[PDB]
């Protein structure tokens, strides 16, 4: 629902989702063949499922086609410094794709907003929903649309008949946390084809033995995982598959 929904939010108030007490596989998110741009710093895009972390912070918002290059640490612009700042130690994983067939319509889709003016910079990982009129001079205006007072929040220009560099791109960032705590969500070991009657090596969560897997004729009780024998040797392990 974070990816496929009926509508999204803006950049001044974006959706914040936390993944806790869950397990997922990042292999389906790589072979989708539907994303436009895919950048992932801090870790390789193909070896991030083995090593896992404590928490996963995912934010979803909309952005134009010419601003997808601004989501990176080490540059200054208009959106990456007033809406969402990227720190130096940013080990995130950004994913973007083009879905102009849902967030655009004839007549002009101006549903989402953005912040253009701001007094100063902001600390990264901080949301700004201040709708106060940014004063550029030294005299008050009592919130009027006259001189020396402009509204920072401005509308969009989304149109489904545009080109490529000005289309609404669904951009998401998957950040990881590193603290003194167990992994709330971790990348699990992938399964492998089942093979028997051959000299294989398996690791069924409690041992790493080398041998064959013959079909037994005895059924175990549905509360055990391993099995010993008379000679005190674990030679019967239930397959969790």
């Amino acid at each position, epitope marked *: 629902e974070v990816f496929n929904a009926t509508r999204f939010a803006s950049v001044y108030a974006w959706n914040r989702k936390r993944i806790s007490n869950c397990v997922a596989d990042y292999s389906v998110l790589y072979n989708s063949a539907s994303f436009s741009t895919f950048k992932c710093y801090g870790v390789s895009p193909t070896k991030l499922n083995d090593l896992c972390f404590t928490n996963v912070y995912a934010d979803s918002f909309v952005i134009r086609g010419d601003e997808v290059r601004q989501i990176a640490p080490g540059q200054t612009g208009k959106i990456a410094d007033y809406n969402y700042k990227l720190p130096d130690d940013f080990t995130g994983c950004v994913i973007a794709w083009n879905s102009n067939n849902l967030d655009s319509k004839v007549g002009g889709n101006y549903n989402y*907003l953005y912040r253009l003016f701001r007094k100063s910079n902001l600390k990264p990982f*901080e949301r700004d*929903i201040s709708t106060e009129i940014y004063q550029a001079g030294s005299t008050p205006c009592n919130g009027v*649309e006259g001189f020396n007072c402009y509204f920072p*929040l401005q*509308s969009y220009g989304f149109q489904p008949t545009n080109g490529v560099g000005y289309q609404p791109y669904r951009v998401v960032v998957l950040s990881f946390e590193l603290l003194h705590a167990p992994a709330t969500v971790c990348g699990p070991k992938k399964s492998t084809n089942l093979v028997k009657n051959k000299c294989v090596n398996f690791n069924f969560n409690g041992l790493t033995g080398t041998g064959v897997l013959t079909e037994s004729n005895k059924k175990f009780l549905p509360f055990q995982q391993f099995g010993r024998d008379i000679a005190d040797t674990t030679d019967a392990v239930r397959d969790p598959q």
Partner: antibody
Amino acid sequence: VQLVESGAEVKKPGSSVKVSCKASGGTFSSYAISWVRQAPGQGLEWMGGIIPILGIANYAQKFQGRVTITADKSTSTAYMELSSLRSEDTAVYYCARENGYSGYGAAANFDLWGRGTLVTVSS
Amino acid sequence: SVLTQPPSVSGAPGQRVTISCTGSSSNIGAGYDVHWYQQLPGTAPKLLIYGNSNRPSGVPDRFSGSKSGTSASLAITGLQAEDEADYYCQSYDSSLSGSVFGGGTKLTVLG
């Protein structure tokens, strides 16, 4: 400032209701205005919030496309239109004001509220 | 909906009475601030405390708000003759794409 609303109003089950929100003074054409309802029996819901400067609608996903909220800059008022009423619409609406701030949370708060409009529909 | 509350809470006029707000890890535990309101049966609700760190104008300092991880708490000291109302827990939900209120607890003496 103080926001005044209309009194009690009844309608037909399947017609349109026309209420308004008046503002006394200023500080209405610079901040966002939302509508919060309340019905005896359950909690408080939130239909959506409308900005008067840009005139952009922002509703929720739980409410379908059946209510429209407009804004006016000439007299600084807002109107509410809701047709095809049901038997659950017996509640009261409030004309609230939002004042954003900065911080790690940045949640929408309702510092200024309205009076209330009792809208009861039945046979 | 996604926010639950106890239906009633008992207290004594002179002790500390606390309440808890429990939700999910995407609306309150994600990092969003919580807002507490008071629903008096006979007038419009007003603002009591925003962000659990600041104090608005016109409210007493007896209300204390805190956020312990994924749950918010409200603590009061002393029961006066104006606490016959309902307390609601409001937080911004991303799955609902907007603000959602809580259930509401009743705290009053029948007398």
